[PDB]
């Protein structure tokens, strides 16, 4: 089984929506020679996000129920106890998945990358998977994580300037990095300021690029505006 044979398996796992296996099939590639291609970089992201996404969803659902039951007029303690153990179970699962990849980013992927359009991806990813840890961490350790996110996102943002304003990676960063400022910190000003810059900067370069990447870039721009229109309350 060569590399090309594994790529196909990563594609088959994705096609069959078996993401836990996909994460392994991408680990099988991660250990080979050279950097990842654009095809391989995407599959990587796809694998990990559809492994983390379900658990992110679970955590919010449980947290919200835990909130409901505590607020009840005559709460049941053993239930509140049993929910809170379960939330911690999922919290366990999340951090495993975040560390798993963050490790790979730090040790494997960031150092070996040469081109900028790969570097922004791998930092943006670090940012994202720190941000996902910050979604359920308590204040003092959360603050340390936010610090690590902010650095990955700043490192990504510094380098993104080399890419064209309409580059999906460059726009994808700004989106997630504004979402960081809005959700993990509580800076609407910074988030709006950041999103408008990327949105407006895309609008200028709209003419120059986006020939076949129009769909990917266009979708993100739509997302930026969707956020921006929500966040003008500030």
């Amino acid at each position: 089984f060569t590399r090309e044979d594994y790529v196909f398996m990563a594609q088959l796992n994705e096609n069959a929506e078996r993401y836990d296996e996909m994460v392994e099939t991408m680990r099988k590639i991660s250990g080979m020679e050279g950097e990842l291609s654009d095809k391989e970089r995407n599959l990587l992201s796809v694998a990990y996000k559809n492994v983390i996404g379900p658990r992110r969803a679970a955590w919010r659902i449980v947290s919200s129920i835990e909130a409901k039951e505590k607020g009840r007029q005559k709460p049941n303690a053993k239930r509140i106890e049993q929910i809170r153990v379960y939330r911690q179970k999922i919290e366990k699962e999340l951090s495993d998945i975040c560390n798993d990849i963050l490790k790979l980013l730090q040790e494997q992927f960031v150092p070996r990358s040469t081109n900028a359009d790969a570097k922004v991806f791998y930092y943006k990813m670090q940012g994202d998977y720190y941000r996902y840890l910050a979604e359920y961490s308590s204040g003092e350790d959360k603050e340390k994580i936010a610090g690590s996110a902010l650095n990955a996102y700043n490192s990504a943002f510094e380098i993104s300037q080399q890419l064209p304003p309409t580059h999906p990676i460059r726009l994808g960063l700004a989106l997630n990095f504004s979402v960081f400022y809005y959700e993990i910190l509580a800076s609407p000003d910074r988030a709006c300021e950041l999103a408008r810059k990327a949105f407006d900067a895309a609008i200028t370069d709209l003419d120059k690029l986006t020939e076949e990447s129009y769909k990917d870039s266009t979708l993100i721009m739509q997302l930026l505006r969707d956020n921006l229109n929500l966040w003008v309350t500030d």
Binding site: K49, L171, L173, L175, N176, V179, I220
Partner: peptide, 4 residues
């Protein structure tokens, strides 16, 4: 939402 965030980037896909």
């Amino acid at each position: 939402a965030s980037a896909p």
